[PDB]
Amino acid sequence: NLSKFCIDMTAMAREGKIDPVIGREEEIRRVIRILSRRTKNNPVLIGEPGVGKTTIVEGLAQRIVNADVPDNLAACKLLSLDVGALVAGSKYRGEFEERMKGVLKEIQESKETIILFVDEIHLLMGLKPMLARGQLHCIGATTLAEYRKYIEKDAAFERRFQQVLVKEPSITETISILRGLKEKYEVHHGV
Amino acid sequence: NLSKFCIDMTAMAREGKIDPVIGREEEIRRVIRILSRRTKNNPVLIGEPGVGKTTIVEGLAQRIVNADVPDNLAACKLLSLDVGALVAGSKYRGEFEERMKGVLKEIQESKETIILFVDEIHLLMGLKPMLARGQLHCIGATTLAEYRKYIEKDAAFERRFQQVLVKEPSITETISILRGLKEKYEVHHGVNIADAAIVAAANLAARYLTSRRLPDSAVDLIDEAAAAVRVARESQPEIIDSLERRLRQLKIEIHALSREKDEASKARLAQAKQDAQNVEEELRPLREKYERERQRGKAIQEAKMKLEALRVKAEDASRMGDHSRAADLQYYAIPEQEAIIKRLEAEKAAADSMITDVVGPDQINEIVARWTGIPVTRLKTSEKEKLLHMEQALSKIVVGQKEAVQSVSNAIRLQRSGLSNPNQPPSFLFCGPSGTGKTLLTKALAEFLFDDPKSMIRFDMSEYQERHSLSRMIGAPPGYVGHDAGGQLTEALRRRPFSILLFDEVEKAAKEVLTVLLQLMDDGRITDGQGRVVDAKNCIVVMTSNLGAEYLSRAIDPTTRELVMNTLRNYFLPEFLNRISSIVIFNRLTRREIRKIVDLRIAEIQKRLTDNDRNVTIKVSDEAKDKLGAQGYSPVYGARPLQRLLEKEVLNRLAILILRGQIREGEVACVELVDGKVQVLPNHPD
Amino acid sequence: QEAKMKLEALRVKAEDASRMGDHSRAADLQYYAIPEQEAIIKRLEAEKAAADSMITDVVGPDQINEIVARWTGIPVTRLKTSEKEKLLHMEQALSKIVVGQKEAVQSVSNAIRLQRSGLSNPNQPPSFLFCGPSGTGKTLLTKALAEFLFDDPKSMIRFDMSEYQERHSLSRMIGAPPGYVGHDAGGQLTEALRRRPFSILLFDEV
Numbered sequence A: 001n002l003s004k005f006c007i008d009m010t011a012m013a014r015e016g017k018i019d020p021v022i023g024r025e026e027e028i029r030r031v032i033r034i035l036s037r038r039t040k041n042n043p044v045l046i047g048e049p050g051v052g053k054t055t056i057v058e059g060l061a062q063r064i065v066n067a068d069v070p071d072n073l074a075a076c077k078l079l080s081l082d083v084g085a086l087v088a089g090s091k092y093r094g095e096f097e098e099r100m101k102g103v104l105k106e107i108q109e110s111k112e113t114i115i116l117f118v119d120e121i122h123l124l125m126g127l128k129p130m131l132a133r134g135q136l137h138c139i140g141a142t143t144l145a146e147y148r149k150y151i152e153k154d155a156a157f158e159r160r161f162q163q164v165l166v167k168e169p170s171i172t173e174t175i176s177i178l179r180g181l182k183e184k185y186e187v188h189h190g191v
Numbered sequence B: 001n002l003s004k005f006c007i008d009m010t011a012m013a014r015e016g017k018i019d020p021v022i023g024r025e026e027e028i029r030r031v032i033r034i035l036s037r038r039t040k041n042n043p044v045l046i047g048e049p050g051v052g053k054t055t056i057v058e059g060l061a062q063r064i065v066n067a068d069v070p071d072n073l074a075a076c077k078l079l080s081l082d083v084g085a086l087v088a089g090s091k092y093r094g095e096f097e098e099r100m101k102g103v104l105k106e107i108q109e110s111k112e113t114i115i116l117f118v119d120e121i122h123l124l125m126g127l128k129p130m131l132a133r134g135q136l137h138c139i140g141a142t143t144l145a146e147y148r149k150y151i152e153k154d155a156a157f158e159r160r161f162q163q164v165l166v167k168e169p170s171i172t173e174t175i176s177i178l179r180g181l182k183e184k185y186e187v188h189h190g191v192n193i194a195d196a197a198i199v200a201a202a203n204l205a206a207r208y209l210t211s212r213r214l215p216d217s218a219v220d221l222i223d224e225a226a227a228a229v230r231v232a233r234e235s236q237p238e239i240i241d242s243l244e245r246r247l248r249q250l251k252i253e254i255h256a257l258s259r260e261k262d263e264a265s266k267a268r269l270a271q272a273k274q275d276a277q278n279v280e281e282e283l284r285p286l287r288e289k290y291e292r293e294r295q296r297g298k299a300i301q302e303a304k305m306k307l308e309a310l311r312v313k314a315e316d317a318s319r320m321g322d323h324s325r326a327a328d329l330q331y332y333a334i335p336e337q338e339a340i341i342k343r344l345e346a347e348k349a350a351a352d353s354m355i356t357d358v359v360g361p362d363q364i365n366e367i368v369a370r371w372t373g374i375p376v377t378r379l380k381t382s383e384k385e386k387l388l389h390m391e392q393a394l395s396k397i398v399v400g401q402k403e404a405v406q407s408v409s410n411a412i413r414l415q416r417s418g419l420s421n422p423n424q425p426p427s428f429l430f431c432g433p434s435g436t437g438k439t440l441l442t443k444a445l446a447e448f449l450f451d452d453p454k455s456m457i458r459f460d461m462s463e464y465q466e467r468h469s470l471s472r473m474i475g476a477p478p479g480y481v482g483h484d485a486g487g488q489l490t491e492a493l494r495r496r497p498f499s500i501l502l503f504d505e506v507e508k509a510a511k512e513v514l515t516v517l518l519q520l521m522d523d524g525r526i527t528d529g530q531g532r533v534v535d536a537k538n539c540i541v542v543m544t545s546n547l548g549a550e551y552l553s554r555a556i557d558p559t560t561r562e563l564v565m566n567t568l569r570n571y572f573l574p575e576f577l578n579r580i581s582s583i584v585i586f587n588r589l590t591r592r593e594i595r596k597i598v599d600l601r602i603a604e605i606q607k608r609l610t611d612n613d614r615n616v617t618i619k620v621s622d623e624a625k626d627k628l629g630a631q632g633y634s635p636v637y638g639a640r641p642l643q644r645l646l647e648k649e650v651l652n653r654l655a656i657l658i659l660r661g662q663i664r665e666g667e668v669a670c671v672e673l674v675d676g677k678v679q680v681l682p683n684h685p686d
Numbered sequence C: 001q002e003a004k005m006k007l008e009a010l011r012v013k014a015e016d017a018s019r020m021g022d023h024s025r026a027a028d029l030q031y032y033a034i035p036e037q038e039a040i041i042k043r044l045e046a047e048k049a050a051a052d053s054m055i056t057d058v059v060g061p062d063q064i065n066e067i068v069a070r071w072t073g074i075p076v077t078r079l080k081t082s083e084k085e086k087l088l089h090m091e092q093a094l095s096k097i098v099v100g101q102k103e104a105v106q107s108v109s110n111a112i113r114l115q116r117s118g119l120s121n122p123n124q125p126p127s128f129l130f131c132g133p134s135g136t137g138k139t140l141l142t143k144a145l146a147e148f149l150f151d152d153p154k155s156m157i158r159f160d161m162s163e164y165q166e167r168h169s170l171s172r173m174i175g176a177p178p179g180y181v182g183h184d185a186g187g188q189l190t191e192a193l194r195r196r197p198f199s200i201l202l203f204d205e206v
């Protein structure tokens, strides 16, 4: 089983392994709204590194397990593909292609409705998850420049995604995040 | 086969994959007429993004399959080239050239008469489909600016096309489009769409979503509202959520109370079982009615989807002469289906907030509010309410021009109530000394009508003083001075129709430029540099002047009225002045009026202090307020020096004292008149 | 700290119990285990402050200012000084670099003080037009402002308007729609604002 390359984010949410998510309510509503479409129902988060793209997906995992989702997403297993361990853990050989087809087909067969999150999705554009029959739901993340230079140059693939701009928080917004994270980092380091 | 880059639009038409086309009959006749020529038989659609250029070609595909075309186009395969996937799906390498030659030569060989549609055709001009032997028929689409800057600069290629101007629809025309599209978007998202939302989307898109053109801006708005209700209808109502959680809570408390042995626990454990039972007694009827009724709204929506699919099969049967299958569907399948929808729907209203599966005006006003950033409360207020208290709203910004505020307010009320010429935009000439409120009133009008200072566009007539400058205003014919930049006015009217056009110091405009304003004021439309007539029914014209400040001393007086208006009669021709809705005169601001302007500005500074963390309150003594108003006014620059004067004398020191801690939180910044000069004093020594 | 860790672990088990409809175990934790734990933390913590530099187990502003200083290479002494102190003697600090432009130094200093004290529009960045002969201090004052506000010359980003003289050059400034001239490089200004928000934008020969 190609669980070597994916982590169950919905599982992590049930086990308290996801630090709290502060704010970002409208962005998570947008992701939910996009996913619930039948049209182009794959969100792509677009923001600078470190603005919180990943923790938005983490919040969605928290909402799936807490029934704070629409019915079409309630029984979803939200998987995070470790593309870093995939392209770097590989060479020019046919293992990049073989590894991704393996995970893409494990998603194929098993009967949980599965949403695949791929951070740094531009690394997959230099490959072809054209399982857009309604087989897989995908959440992508990348920066604006790399979305322009690597994702925007394959329209047919892009048009099935809908941009979600994730702006950088204000200082005021940042301390609310740090305040909300305060207790987790207190207990973790023991200080 | 290079079908990788093209989609068969005529095929899509037979498969019901093209949403309906509403109106636009004369434009489709023009395309048909051009295509049928032997001369220049390639139409190029020219219009702003989202006005419906593509759906015009889509309608032609509908006409080709329905034999509603002339014979020369009946057997045509209308292909749409995905130029976006072509130039972007490629680099500097020779694949752009190789990919296009491949498609251009697949068109070459196969024997269907093929019409190629290329949207955003300017992307192909930076290539050479000179197959104008009569090999390919081409339909192009682009905007006017890009047609001028990229298509008009290769004549030989251009002359084989014939322009088709696709103007932006009216609001009225836009709701007809949305009404015609209503059922398609209902079945697609599986929700219902109220008509008042459609009227709301069209009216609000035009007013507040000025960045995109009708009807796309209204279509995107309804489509986003529908998608927002697609998820609401698949979520439990709020009261089922709240009930279900208190129930689960009481079940926890019941398990816990049943362990403690004491007198008080047992008396409330029995009460907890009852409270649990009460909740379950309220929850089961509701949760049952919700699912009972969400299951039927879903049964209706598929009932609608098989109906539509039957009609596609039926339209194609009757098109291909298969009367056997066409009789199956048209007489038995489809009415059996329609009977299922009639019954499921009739019981739906009969069953009878909960189960939100409807796009209403609230959902439209909320979606816009998120996009526009305007509070939802300001969008729900009826236009009729604002207009009735318009003098109230403007007078909070403009002091001492009551006669002016009344004129602006009356003119606007005359047009929303339908008593003014619908082909003439409201036009104003503000006359009076500098710094009296002429520009400010226009800003207040912009923020009152469109809740956005950007809704006004400023033209300084000091930059249009010579006859040469007219091409800057309206554009120029090809090969001339500023053909590609276009005109400032004409380009503003195409991209921001619902705007306020401010012409500052109109007395200095060249007589040729004034002529354009008179056309704008009289006919509601102007002709650009290339003879093209651009529309302007939905704008507002404000012109400012100061040719009357000579006869206005600080005192409004009626004998002084025609000394300024006779000064106007020689600078402007009588036909110019007659076509202005209202010639409005501003007088000089009195000493008391200048004083409230000072209070207005400290109120704004007070707001930023409150908007930030600081609990510092600014109070101004009477005599200090008097010196500010005496130092502030000028018989030459009016109230203009006031904003900087406060900054220099009060705000500079008030800053320093705040950061020094000499005026702390909760205290008052007292601004006084010490030794005859305005100052604000500390409250604690350093 | 372990009392806090078992508390958190209990809340995970309790959240999952109530999620899976196990009201038996959910009542164990929510009503008995967790408050028995919370009572242990309340007592151990109450005596902690009551017992009463030594035992440094606190992240304070000094620890933040020191960590940054190591990363940024700025002396710790320059990071402890309050923003209010610098701004009050701003004319002093700039005048050590810019000679003979006292009216200019006062204008820059007053505008910055207007915004940290909250009296300027919070939606408008401070904007300046320096006007005067070459080699009088216009660029230098902007460098001194950069090193005074952010203690780094890199905090300013320079745009030479001699390279934006034609209408064609706007796409260089802000970018272009897909398939156009410099869609991928983006704009110089727009890309600068995304990646360096707290910057000084110098437009030379505007």
Ligand SMILES: Nc1ncnc2c1ncn2[C@@H]1O[C@H](COP(=O)(O)OP(=O)(O)O)[C@@H](O)[C@H]1O
Binding pocket: A019, A020, A021, A022, A023, A024, A047, A048, A049, A050, A051, A052, A053, A054, A055, A056, A177, A181
């Ligand atoms: N809304 C938020 N609430 C709590 N922590 C956040 C939030 N946004 C970002 N963070 C924190 O910021 C750090 C990086 O954020 P991340 O989501 O990884 O950024 P990105 O994925 O966009 O590079 C993480 O340690 C995360 O805990």
Ligand SMILES: Nc1ncnc2c1ncn2[C@@H]1O[C@H](COP(=O)(O)OP(=O)(O)O)[C@@H](O)[C@H]1O
Binding pocket: B019, B020, B021, B022, B023, B024, B047, B048, B049, B050, B051, B052, B053, B054, B055, B056, B177, B181, B215, B216, B219
């Ligand atoms: N006459 C019309 N009838 C129905 N829908 C229309 C019409 N004109 C425009 N639309 C709608 O407006 C949206 C954008 O129109 P489109 O033709 O793509 O604009 P353009 O191609 O000029 O950018 C589409 O979703 C389309 O359904």
Ligand SMILES: Nc1ncnc2c1ncn2[C@@H]1O[C@H](COP(=O)(O)OP(=O)(O)O)[C@@H](O)[C@H]1O
Binding pocket: B397, B398, B399, B400, B401, B432, B433, B434, B435, B436, B437, B438, B439, B440, B441, B544, B589, B597, B638, B639, B640, B643
């Ligand atoms: N009647 C007035 N009420 C309030 N403020 C005014 C008035 N007249 C002038 N001002 C102030 O003076 C400034 C410039 O006035 P403006 O209306 O632009 O002058 P003009 O009459 O030359 O257009 C405005 O920003 C405003 O603050």
Ligand SMILES: Nc1ncnc2c1ncn2[C@@H]1O[C@H](COP(=O)(O)OP(=O)(O)O)[C@@H](O)[C@H]1O
Binding pocket: C097, C098, C099, C100, C101, C132, C133, C134, C135, C136, C137, C138, C139, C140, C141
């Ligand atoms: N007022 C001044 N004080 C100190 N040095 C100056 C002054 N004006 C010019 N200089 C010197 O001249 C050089 C260039 O001056 P600069 O401010 O860039 O000129 P400009 O006014 O054209 O921007 C600086 O490196 C600086 O050394």
